[PDB]
Amino acid sequence: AVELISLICEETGIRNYTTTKNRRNKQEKLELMKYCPKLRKHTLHKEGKIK
Amino acid sequence: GQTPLYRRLPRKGFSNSDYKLEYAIVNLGDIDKKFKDGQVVNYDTLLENKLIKKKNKKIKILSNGKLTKKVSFEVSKISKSAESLVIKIGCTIQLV
Amino acid sequence: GSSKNGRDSISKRLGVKRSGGQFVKAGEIIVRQRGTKFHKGKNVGLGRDYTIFALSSGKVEFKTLKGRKYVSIV
RNA sequence: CCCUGGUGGUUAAAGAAAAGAGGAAACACCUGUUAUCAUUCCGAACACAGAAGUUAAGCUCUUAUUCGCUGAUGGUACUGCGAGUUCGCGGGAGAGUAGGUUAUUGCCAGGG
RNA sequence: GGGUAGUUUGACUGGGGCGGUCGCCUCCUAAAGAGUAACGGAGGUGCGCAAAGGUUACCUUAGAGUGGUUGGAAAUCACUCUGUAAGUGUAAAGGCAUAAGGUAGCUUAACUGUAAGACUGACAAGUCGAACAGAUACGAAAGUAGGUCUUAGUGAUCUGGCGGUGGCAAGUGGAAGCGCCGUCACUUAACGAAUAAAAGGUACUCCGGGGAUAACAGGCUUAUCCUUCCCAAGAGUUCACAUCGACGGAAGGGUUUGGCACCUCGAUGUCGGCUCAUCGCAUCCUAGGGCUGGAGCAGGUCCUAAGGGUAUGGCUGUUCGCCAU
RNA sequence: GGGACUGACACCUGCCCGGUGCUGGAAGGUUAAGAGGAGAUGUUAGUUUAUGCGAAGCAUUGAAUUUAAGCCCCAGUAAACGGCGGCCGUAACUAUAACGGUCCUAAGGUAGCGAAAUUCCUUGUCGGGUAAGUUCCGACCCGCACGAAUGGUGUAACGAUUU
RNA sequence: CUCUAGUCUGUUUAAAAAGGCAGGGAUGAGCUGUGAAUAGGAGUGAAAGGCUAAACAAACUCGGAGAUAGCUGGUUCUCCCCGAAAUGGAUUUAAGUUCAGCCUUAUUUUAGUUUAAUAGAGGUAGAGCACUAAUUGAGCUAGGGCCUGUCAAAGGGUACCAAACUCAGUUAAACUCCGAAUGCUAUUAAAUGAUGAAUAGGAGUGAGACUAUGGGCGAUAAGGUUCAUAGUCGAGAGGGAAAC
């Protein structure tokens, strides 16, 4: 009941990060302030698919 | 029966042979030791003076050793440090 | 009726790596341990797994206070 | 300098309990919640504002060491080595016994 | 689609099979550094958490006693003593009062590029790490944070999928494709993974070897077995020892069932019967005794004694045993 | 005419179509090649200020639609390969259980036979034979683990068979 | 004339399957002569895994072929110097192989090794009950039942069943408030003299055994099995333990 999600930089769309998240516990759309190395600046990353 | 080292480790990529631009290195120290003023360091003179072999015809000039003699060059590539030193000594450079 | 058990982990090689009075340089590992069997004194640091390491060159020393052992670099 | 308060250093408990002594200054108790501040309720704590009163408690000192803590000297266990054999050389507990113990000290502020 | 063909069908193992086990973590064995085996002794594990992570700030359990609506041994509240015995998602151990325990606010460092120096180590790998640049979170600040108090929650290479980059581009310009960076798909669990793809029989057997390894014997051992002996509560009308001796205790014998695998598998022929024996005495008979709860006859128990003798048949391959004389 | 199994003769040959085979049946579910080219991709005359778009040609592709047998599915077939159960209680002593209840299966062994070329316990128990019979004959049934064409139970005659 | 039950001889036989006593069939599914036909994954088979040129669970000859063996055996003149291992890790591995460990040659390097002194970290032996458990006898006493002015109200006699507590006394690899000896590490000074290390060439070994201590398993049995330290054998002749 745990899936591998990918955190995507909002303003570039690059899949910068991958992480684990438990489905059937929140089924929300996890957002995380992560550092986007393309821009040398922190920004918002959203949950998304892997494949 | 243990998995050999060349099978535990991964590979890295192609070799890019068949498309290399391969060609001979000649150094400034060599030119200083072998030549003198006023002649054209080029394919013909380096070949006859036995600094390269006439299989390759795309010489590059590198900057080991020091060069003191004003010369003319007709070469295919040149390093930035070497052409700076050679222009400073007062030679001339034509890229062919 | 065979044996119900027989199972052991790999030995982890804990213990004191540099003896008191030895000369170490910066970054040396002094103790490997689970938990602060030895606590941190002057000029040493504690890793995330309670490893003791030397922040500067010097000589290891162990002191005892209220029954607890402290490691320092002097 | 000494007292008081603050802050360290050296580790053996520098531990609690009961009794007695004081309080100029200092510390604390204590007073009000009104302002900013705090509690999963409570100005108890925290926080702010102060000087009516007191050693009562905390604190310091003095006590029978009352509990704890510490603890020899010998002897034993154990032990390395040994052509001496329950022996030869060296190392030497724990427990118990005789005791001991209610810290010491550096520099800052106040006034003696 | 066994009509036919090519093959596979693991290893450890006090012989093999059957059973069990195979990776990783914690403790003991482990003989006070590290390491150290067995089919030795106890357990866990193929995760969980968007907080149960990061930081700031503030608090302290469990137990016993005591006073209390139901309330009882034990719920919640208050005090005293005790001082971590409580609690730390999850086994155990090492730690944890400055708490790593409990609560609340904010928050995403569960970051990019790196990394002096090390630990552990056949190798492959694994582990710790100050500090530096970018950019955040918390904090007044100093500072801390590169997931979780620590140590288990894992899987090489090849192949392929997805996103990015734009390096390679078979005359040139593109492109297919590949490389690079990010990343996904293996109870490959027999968990350093012989293939993308695999079960049995042979007493019809064959070959190469082994006493490296079993069955028959020898050897070591004596649990078991057999023969005694020590203690004597008792039974025996009373009377421990005429006789039996329970409950325990100490040995020998090497015969029984076993243990070990030391000799022998380029061969040590295996059970009974027949024939022929020889030796031991722990004596079945004959011989000599002591005591009897020995009147006599006939016995019971013990000691000495191996010279000689120690039946014919029925059943069963039987040794053995039962039965008839 | 071929194959399978049984094996003169006499009396008989019981129950089960779930499993696996064989036979028959297509209503569906599923399914290959072949047709079908939605659409996507590379190239570029041109357009686009240019990228981007990009007609035609040439290539790489592919879905929706269509489609057989087979499998799933619906029946039959055991002289097809095969299968044919447990527990508990109960009568004018004691014993057993004609009987009853219950769980499960496709169905739970009928006739006959039974310490057998089958029976471990076992040299079962009783009777006959022998002075004495682990063999033999006749029975009992508590059939470890008989059983009806892998035939069941008998049988005159026959046997370099066994007792 | 054809076959071979029973038995004996034979068994380095007269015979690479016969001989002597005998036995079965003998008007038939009979015996036999001379030709012919069916061939190796095939034939034939009144069915034994029988037979197909004395060998058949897949004939013989030649060729691939000097097939492949982690298995067994063998490997030839001399002398000088040094000299192992039978362990660790991994393995379709356990009788194999590979890396490390141990050996040798060449070059370079100089710092092993044992003491003594000083200073460090353990938790073993031993000991102890302060923790986790086990446990002996008294003292005390909740609680449980027994008995009694009994209803089952509040009760009382307590032989006991007994928590906690007190005194005295024991047990533990997975208990530790304590705790050595040796061993381990660092430095220095002496003592010993190439025993250390680095690079490169070549290996072998990866079946061990017993003895003296500490253990685990077994039955404080085994010349048993499995580990740790040291020795010897292994690879060691000589003297002693009668041989060994």
Next chain:
RNA sequence: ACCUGCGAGUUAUCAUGUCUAGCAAGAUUAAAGCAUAGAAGUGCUGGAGUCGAAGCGAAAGCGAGUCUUAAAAGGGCGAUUU
């Protein structure tokens, strides 16, 4: 069984180390041709090629520096000392 004979790390190539010989930042020819004589020689000729002389990186590319990244900021591999 005895005795006597026969009977087992060899050859061709490549890799690498050592020794010897020669040259030297250079070393060296292979196939093949001519001359000579008939004498499967040995003398010239033959530079095609091979190994060194520069490395780093998957590669482009840049080079005593290069790769990793904005960073020689620090490291990995180099080196200036052949």
Next chain:
RNA sequence: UAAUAGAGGCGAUACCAGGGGAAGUGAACCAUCUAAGUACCCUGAGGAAAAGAAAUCAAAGAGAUUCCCUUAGUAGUGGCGA
């Protein structure tokens, strides 16, 4: 039928072309792969056979086929295992 012309078989336990085509083995099993288009069989010829005068190579400007030297154990290929 007639007329001529040429074939038949052998040799060479060699060489060549075409057709058919293994396995013992190695991969420490094995099935892809390897051995290998090898062994062998069959049909054809020759003194040689075959191939051969570009609808070729390949990024160089060369100019038929064949045989040596090198490229080179390189480019690639392979349960990217051997």
Next chain:
RNA sequence: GUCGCUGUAGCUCAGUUGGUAGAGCAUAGGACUGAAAAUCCUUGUGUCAGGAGUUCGAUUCUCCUCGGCGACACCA
């Protein structure tokens, strides 16, 4: 990974190219038989799985998901 679909009453099943919320079984009540059965009759049993959009309104129409499906292709 993909294709064909479904989820509506306690169960099963309709559901109309969009204006119904029901059919059968069962549940409960009345009646019937001597009861158990079988009629016969009443009677409940819904965001029609959730959301967005289409319509004037949506179980229905489309799309995105949730959970469960049947079937197909890969599986180092």
